[PDB]
Amino acid sequence: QYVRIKNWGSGEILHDTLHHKATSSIMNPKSLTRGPRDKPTPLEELLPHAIEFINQYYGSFKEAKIEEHLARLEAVTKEIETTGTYQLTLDELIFATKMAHRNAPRCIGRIQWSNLQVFDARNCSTAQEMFQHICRHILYATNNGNIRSAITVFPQRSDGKHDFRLWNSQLIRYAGYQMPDGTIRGDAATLEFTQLCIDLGWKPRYGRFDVLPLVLQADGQDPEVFEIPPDLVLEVTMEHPKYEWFQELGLKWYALPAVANMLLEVGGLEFPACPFNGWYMGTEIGVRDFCDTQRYNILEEVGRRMGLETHTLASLWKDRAVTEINVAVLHSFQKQNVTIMDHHTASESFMKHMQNEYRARGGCPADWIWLVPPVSGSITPVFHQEMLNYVLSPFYYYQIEPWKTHIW
Amino acid sequence: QYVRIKNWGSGEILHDTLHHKATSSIMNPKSLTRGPRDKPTPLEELLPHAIEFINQYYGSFKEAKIEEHLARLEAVTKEIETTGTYQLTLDELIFATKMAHRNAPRCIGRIQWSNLQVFDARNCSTAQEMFQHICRHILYATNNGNIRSAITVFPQRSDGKHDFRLWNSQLIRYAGYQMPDGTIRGDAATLEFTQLCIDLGWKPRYGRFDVLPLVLQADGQDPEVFEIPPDLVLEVTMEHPKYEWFQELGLKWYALPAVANMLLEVGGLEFPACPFNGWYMGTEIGVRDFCDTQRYNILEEVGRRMGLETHTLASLWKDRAVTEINVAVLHSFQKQNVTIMDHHTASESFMKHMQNEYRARGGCPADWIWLVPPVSGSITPVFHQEMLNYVLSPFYYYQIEPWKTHIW
Ligand code: HEM
Ligand code: HEM
Ligand SMILES: C[C@H](O)[C@H](O)[C@H]1CNc2nc(N)[nH]c(=O)c2N1
Ligand SMILES: C[C@H](O)[C@H](O)[C@H]1CNc2nc(N)[nH]c(=O)c2N1
Ligand SMILES: [N+]
Ligand SMILES: [N+]
Numbered sequence A, B: 001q002y003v004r005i006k007n008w009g010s011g012e013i014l015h016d017t018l019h020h021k022a023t024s025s026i027m028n029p030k031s032l033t034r035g036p037r038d039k040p041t042p043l044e045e046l047l048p049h050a051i052e053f054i055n056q057y058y059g060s061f062k063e064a065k066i067e068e069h070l071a072r073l074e075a076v077t078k079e080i081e082t083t084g085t086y087q088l089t090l091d092e093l094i095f096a097t098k099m100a101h102r103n104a105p106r107c108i109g110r111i112q113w114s115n116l117q118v119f120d121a122r123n124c125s126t127a128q129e130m131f132q133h134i135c136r137h138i139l140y141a142t143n144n145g146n147i148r149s150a151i152t153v154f155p156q157r158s159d160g161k162h163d164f165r166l167w168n169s170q171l172i173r174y175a176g177y178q179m180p181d182g183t184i185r186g187d188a189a190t191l192e193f194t195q196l197c198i199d200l201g202w203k204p205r206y207g208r209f210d211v212l213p214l215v216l217q218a219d220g221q222d223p224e225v226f227e228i229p230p231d232l233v234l235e236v237t238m239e240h241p242k243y244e245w246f247q248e249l250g251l252k253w254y255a256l257p258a259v260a261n262m263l264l265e266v267g268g269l270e271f272p273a274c275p276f277n278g279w280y281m282g283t284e285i286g287v288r289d290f291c292d293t294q295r296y297n298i299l300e301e302v303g304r305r306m307g308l309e310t311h312t313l314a315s316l317w318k319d320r321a322v323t324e325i326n327v328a329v330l331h332s333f334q335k336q337n338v339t340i341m342d343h344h345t346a347s348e349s350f351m352k353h354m355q356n357e358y359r360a361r362g363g364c365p366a367d368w369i370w371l372v373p374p375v376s377g378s379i380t381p382v383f384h385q386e387m388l389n390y391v392l393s394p395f396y397y398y399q400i401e402p403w404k405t406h407i408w
Helices: A043-058 A066-083 A090-102 A127-145 A188-199 A244-249 A283-291 A299-304 A317-335 A343-361 B043-058 B066-083 B090-102 B127-145 B188-199 B244-249 B283-291 B299-304 B317-335 B343-361
Strands: A003-006 A013-016 A117-120 A150-153 A214-217 A224-226 A235-237 A252-254 A263-266 A269-271 A395-397 B003-006 B013-016 B117-120 B150-153 B214-217 B224-226 B235-237 B252-254 B263-266 B269-271 B395-397
Touching: A013 B343, A043 A066, A043 A090, A090 A117, A090 A150, A090 A263, A090 A395, A117 A127, A127 A150, A127 A214, A127 A224, A235 A317, A244 A299, A283 A317, A299 A317, A317 B317, A343 B013, B043 B066, B043 B090, B090 B117, B090 B150, B090 B263, B090 B395, B117 B127, B127 B150, B127 B214, B127 B224, B235 B317, B244 B299, B283 B317, B299 B317
Parallel strands: A117 A150, B117 B150
Antiparallel strands: A003 A013, A214 A224, A235 A252, A263 A269, A263 A395, B003 B013, B214 B224, B235 B252, B263 B269, B263 B395
């Protein structure tokens, strides 16, 4: 029938009908999602996929180890024949995690795809044991502000009813509540989820930079709530380098961008819990987290303190404020020795990458909509670059929100 | 086989191969192009299409005129049966031109789709007669700076060998030459075409704001060259409202954005010559025409005059200059009483439109990549709006460059 369409600012959804009369930019397309299941992967699908992967892994060395490649193929088949899926070698998980990042069409930082730290936590079985690993991860990646790229891989899905997974969008992340004023405090984005932590007994601190708790589900079991040891969450306080009134704003952001809720797919296997992290590109904080109507929405407050024509849209005052907010974020990171890269530098880098990729392996999955920064479009190189967006393997899939499917 | 991919900044093209290994943002997709032909449209295709159109035209009144609708269907069939295509009534051309604009997924100004002036020049037969119409058009739309939206429709394609069409990208448009300095003067974009006007005896004035000649092809015949009466081309000189040194830059742009080279498709008919115009949205000039590496590339010159860290990319100096260049353009239009709308105002408007459209007829073809402005992305509403991009009818198609196919 029709097609549901979302505006993510207003939250308004519309149903398209006109398209049916057609001839001859969705955030979460089904195509980009790998959902739950109730039964192990069938063997007839699993095997071909595993073989494909093992042939990629071996076809990716400089000087081919044929015998080990033939052996591994044999051992993998026997394991599948014998157990009903198969485990990756560590020296295969590491490749899996790097190629999949390499294959994420929506990621600008892929120049760095080779430098990834991999934490093998496939032996995990309890919540407390997940939450320990998560803590280790955070501390490694954070490095006292010198951000290291890392990923923590938990036990692969088996039957689908013993799934490990984080209910958090990203590891470290601020809360948001629907205060009485008609207003909303903290991070509007996490409004719905904040409530859920409340439903599981998390004490609401009611502020605007409250780090939310990890909500961990292990081996299919109901999710237990863990608070993050505030010693690990490193934050950057926001000061402008001119407008001394900019600290009066009382702004800060967490330093670690660690996406928590995506699924890894490799050789037919699926890991619905594999949190990863790079570092921040300024605009992420300065433009989206700070300036989105859906988010912290500082744009008017900052403009007002600039003596700007705030009620005349043509004044271009948003263009002026946004830019200073970025300047602030950037400046606050460098000050405080927190790793960061500005979107301009980021765009030139990605470009080098892309060039590299095509000479390397003739292509680069790439989603224009996502790879162009939310300010300065035309001004970065990636805007003028035509690109194709395709899904390869291994790959990092979105997933249906855990509370929409989990049975407590 | 592979897939040619263009970067429009560098002009570099790459061939994608990786996509073949796929599982389960192009400027000129074939899908968006209607090309030449050597034979009249076959009747078996033409008729259904005509009927569809006539039923739309009649199904678009408030209070239905069934008898005239049944009559028109009859008269149209007889005409096709009898001549081998059919002519639209004027009160159908007007609807054709408005719906097609209404249906252009890449256009932000569609809120105004109803207000269009239509010049019926289907009776045209000579070049000189096209060039007269073009001149009338320019003068009407320009209105001494109070821009009126207009379109001039020429004779429909028949057999494909008597095509009317303009060889110009847009009516009024600056030239560009490959000067000896290793550099390039005027409008780099029109580098290839400028040469072609030279090949047809146009005297190169060698400047950086030289209006190019109309290159007109009528009834399939070789294109004759006409110079535009400088009295008709209204221009805006660029001054900033602070930086008095901004006029020292010696900048100006033409006031009329009139796209000249697209084809109208309606009820199976095709008009490969139907120039149209709205007015400018500032960023068009301030960001793309002025700041594209491929274009006039002022960004460094403007930054330097701002005492900006021009060799430190992270300085964010591009964000600062671009914004002032826009301020300048906007300010220069309002001064000089030239119609213009800023991209922020434009985005809020389009949004209203889109809302209107869905309540109206449940949909709105819409290409995100194009509808989001080249600066301030996140900051405009259209960024957060998920949208579907579909081709309806009537519709404005791109066309293969005339000199790639015409036989002299
Ligand atoms: C130099 C390090 C990195 C940089 C600068 C970087 C930058 C970014 C940015 C700016 C986004 C968009 C943010 C958003 O709108 O949500 C993104 C998304 C993404 N990145 Fe990277 N990233 C880095 C490391 C990584 C790593 C290590 C991985 C995986 C191993 C990765 C995979 C992804 C994926 C799957 C997305 C999509 C997120 C989503 O769909 O919401 N990136 N990256
Ligand atoms: C309020 C009046 C208008 C405004 C503000 C407006 C704005 C714009 C802008 C900013 C673009 C993109 C410019 C570019 O990147 O080349 C565009 C493209 C386009 N517009 Fe409009 N426009 C207006 C009137 C019209 C009219 C009257 C028509 C047709 C009757 C139209 C149809 C189109 C089409 C077909 C394109 C695609 C051009 C291309 O693909 O290169 N627009 N418009
Ligand atoms: C509707 C639309 O697709 C949506 O706002 C997209 C635009 N491009 C994006 N690009 C990135 N990096 N991150 C995003 O959240 C978005 N949001
Ligand atoms: C490669 C890419 O599609 C190209 O630069 C597009 C981006 N979006 C655009 N949007 C508009 N309005 N005009 C354009 O020329 C473009 N260029
Ligand atoms: N990130
Ligand atoms: N335009």
